[PDB]
Design a protein around this ligand. Structure first.
Ligand SMILES: Nc1ncnc2c1ncn2[C@@H]1O[C@H](COP(=O)(O)OP(=O)(O)O)[C@@H](O)[C@H]1O
Ligand SMILES: Nc1ncnc2c1ncn2[C@@H]1O[C@H](COP(=O)(O)OP(=O)(O)O)[C@@H](O)[C@H]1O
Lengths: 72, 288, 144, 216, 72, 72
């Protein structure tokens, strides 16, 4: 799902997430049997990152931690 | 003797029909044909439309069966394919337009503005474009319906609204077998007929009241229409061809979150509006 | 045409407008215009528009008659030729159809099967057999 | 000599078809012969095809019967007729193909693997008569619909999806009765029209929510 | 010129065709739409009504589609 | 030509019938208008009945909508 949403947001190689933040994402934001509601949140991540990128572009790649989830 | 005259009258209508064919048909339908070959559904999709086109054309001129398929062909030709509005523009200009139409609504405004950020970041790329669905839940007093025009003016898009909810006719959502007397493609498709873009603004007013049970279930039909990826290949009962509904930007209106079927509820991008404050109330009263 | 070939020696624009306006080939509403127009120059001009549209209709109606008459012969000739070609094949098909089918039924009628059902089909079969064109009931009788 | 009479009559009727039946008769001699050559036509399906073939030669003059008859014949021309896809020989390759499309789903993956292993070991035609049928039950969030495309791509069998999301009157999913306009917007056979293989993988929107009318 | 020429031809052919059968048919409809020109509706539905009447101005008398097309 | 001759004979029989049966059918519609006259329905109901018989006469018979229209 993450590669697909990253490709759909066109900002490939600019945002990355750790394996610990995802645990919190599912355990605190979406509680459904499937993962259809998870793709909408994972694309919201890229959509909000694109808002920051458009006004100000950074260099390299950005790593998202469990404490940086509320911003995006 | 009466049969003779009737036959003389017939050729009279024929001569007239042939004259009309030289106008509405022939080169006119040839130009529309080549034009659709330019901006119509892909050829592998247009195949059904061609199927009906061949028979309706092969059918004797003026044949009702020819018109029975002629309406299908005209609906395919009129409905937009691979043609869209101008793409991402400056966010600074559109944010003022979105702010002046409605005070507050920070979440919806953020959603609308950030929808353009990805459109700008995917400039010139080769990735699938999918306009997210939108649902607004809140009391009826909240101006959710005016968003259909507010967002459209925000991105200069064309907008249409369909009064769904409180309906019991699946055939309304997915039209119906063209074989039945007359023909009516699903409402959605009727709404998008006049909007000549593949990414219109569609407002599903109060779909919460959607009533199912008896009769073909309108709601169950909207499952194929609102599938996030299968809408790229969408075959309703009328338009046999797989419609490309991916680019269409959807907005749905609801009043609560307890009267929606589960497949619909766990497929929407949920946006909630709990209600304006009294300071916001006095501000909007003063300004608008 | 008698009223036109008698005053051709006068070149008065008003007189020519009168000649081209009295022959009212249109509704009486237009005739009110010519009846009350203080512009002889425009008189012939507006009559020109009416007669020109009427002239379009003149040729148009003649063409319609020409199209209908030519189509009449083509439809008649086509009807005679096309009917014969089909009636020929349909005659063969009818024999290869119920005519062969009933034969198969006769083959199993060795048990003395009641032919009352056949006679009813024959009523349908004599009528459709004679009709070597169309007769969709023949197909339903065939399945019967 | 009588056989040559039969051939002469057949070529006469074919000639009339070709000369008059636009897109029906000349399309007959041009492509319908090859149609049986490519897809094939059951003799029972063909004998009636030939019986009605000489009956719709009324084009140019015009005949709705000829068109609706021709629509039926054209539908018969393309629907697969005992023509199967190249059967899979390496089920292990299919295993990786299916593992690169989804994660987990060890039950359905093994179910499909068993269904393919039995077919590869069918000695004597006694299993092909019973087509394996799978119904998938669970929450809508699980990826059931795309599983049809995944399985079909792994089988190398062309895929088609059928809209069972809403079906009210009868014949809305099955082929509509013939004799009418002759226009069918999709059907169970339609999927067969989409896939030129007699053995494709076909998935439906759902079964719990389908037929719901009074007439049918 | 072209528009008036096609309107007049449609009117005369409707007149003759409905004099031979069912005078108060598509001639009634063409008179009614000539009225709706003078009492014109929104432009969005004006063209829709014109297209709708044009397609049913070419079919045969008593068509099953015409049964509801005339009443609409 | 024999098919044409039997068509001649059948339309002979049709002549015999429409003399008695057909005229009764016309007399049926004439008596229907006599019914709409004798009852003395108000002007609006008169016009509705006239329009309804107008839409019925334009179309043919043997259709499902025709039964409902006839009874109503
Ligand atoms: N912030 C706002 N600015 C302007 N008008 C507002 C605002 N909030 C609510 N309204 C007004 O409130 C009304 C809500 O009606 P409507 O949008 O039809 O509600 P609903 O979407 O629930 O059916 C409209 O007149 C709308 O313009
Ligand atoms: N284990 C999985 N592997 C791959 N994709 C999965 C998995 N679980 C869920 N999905 C995704 O779930 C989605 C299901 O969408 P779709 O099949 O259209 O509808 P439904 O969820 O109703 O079956 C697909 O995008 C699919 O890739």
């Amino acid at each position: 799902l993450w590669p697909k949403q990253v490709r759909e947001s066109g900002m490939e190689g600019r945002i990355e997430v750790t394996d610990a933040a995802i645990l919190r994402v599912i355990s605190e934001y979406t509680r459904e049997a499937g993962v259809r509601g998870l793709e909408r949140e994972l694309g919201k991540i890229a959509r909000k990152g694109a808002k920051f990128w458009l006004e100000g572009a950074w260099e390299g790649l950005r790593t998202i931690d469990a404490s940086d989830i509320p911003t995006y | 003797d009466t049969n003779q005259r009737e036959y003389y009258l017939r050729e009279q209508m024929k001569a007239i029909q042939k004259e009309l064919g030289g106008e509405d048909g022939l080169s006119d339908l040839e130009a529309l044909r080549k034009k659709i070959e330019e901006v119509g559904m892909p050829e592998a999709v247009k195949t059904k439309a061609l199927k009906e086109l061949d028979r309706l054309e092969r059918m004797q001129q003026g044949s009702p069966e020819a018109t029975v398929a002629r309406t299908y062909l005209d609906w395919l030709t009129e409905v937009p394919w691979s043609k869209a509005d101008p793409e991402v523009l400056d966010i600074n200009h559109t944010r003022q337009v979105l702010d002046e139409d409605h005070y507050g609504l920070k979440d919806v405004k953020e959603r609308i503005l950030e929808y353009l950020a990805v459109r700008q970041l995917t400039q010139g790329l080769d990735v699938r474009n999918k306009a997210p669905i939108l649902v607004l839940v809140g009391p009826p007093g909240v101006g959710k319906t005016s968003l259909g025009r507010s967002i459209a003016r925000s991105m200069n898009r064309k907008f249409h609204r369909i009064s769904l909810g409180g309906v019991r006719d699946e055939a309304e959502i997915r039209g119906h077998r063209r074989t039945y007397i007359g023909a009516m493609p699903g409402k959605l498709i009727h709404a998008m007929k006049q909007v000549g873009v593949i990414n219109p603004v569609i407002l599903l007013d109060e779909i919460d009241k959607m009533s199912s049970d008896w009769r073909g279930d309108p709601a169950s039909a909207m499952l194929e229409v609102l599938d996030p990826e299968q809408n790229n290949t969408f075959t309703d009962h009328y338009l046999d061809v797989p419609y490309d509904l991916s680019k269409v930007f959807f907005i749905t209106t609801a009043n609560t979150l307890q009267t929606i079927p589960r497949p619909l509820l766990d497929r929407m991008e949920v946006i909630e509006i709990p209600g304006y404050t009294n300071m916001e109330k006095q501000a909007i009263a003063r300004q608008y | 045409r008698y009223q036109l070939e008698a005053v051709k020696g006068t070149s008065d624009p008003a007189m020519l407008a009168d000649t081209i306006a009295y022959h009212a080939t249109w509704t009486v509403a237009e005739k009110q215009e010519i009846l009350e127009l203080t512009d002889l120059e425009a008189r012939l001009k507006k009559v020109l528009g009416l007669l020109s549209r009427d002239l379009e209709r003149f040729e148009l109606d003649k063409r319609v008659a020409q199209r209908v008459k030519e189509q009449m012969d083509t439809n008649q000739r086509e009807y005679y030729l096309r009917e014969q070609m089909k009636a020929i094949q349909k005659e063969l098909g009818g024999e290869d159809g119920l005519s062969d089918l009933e034969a198969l039924r006769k083959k199993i009628e060795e048990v003395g099967m009641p032919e009352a059902v056949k006679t009813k089909a024959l009523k349908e079969l004599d009528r459709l057999e004679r009709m070597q064109q169309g007769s969709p009931e023949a197909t339903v009788a065939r399945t019967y």
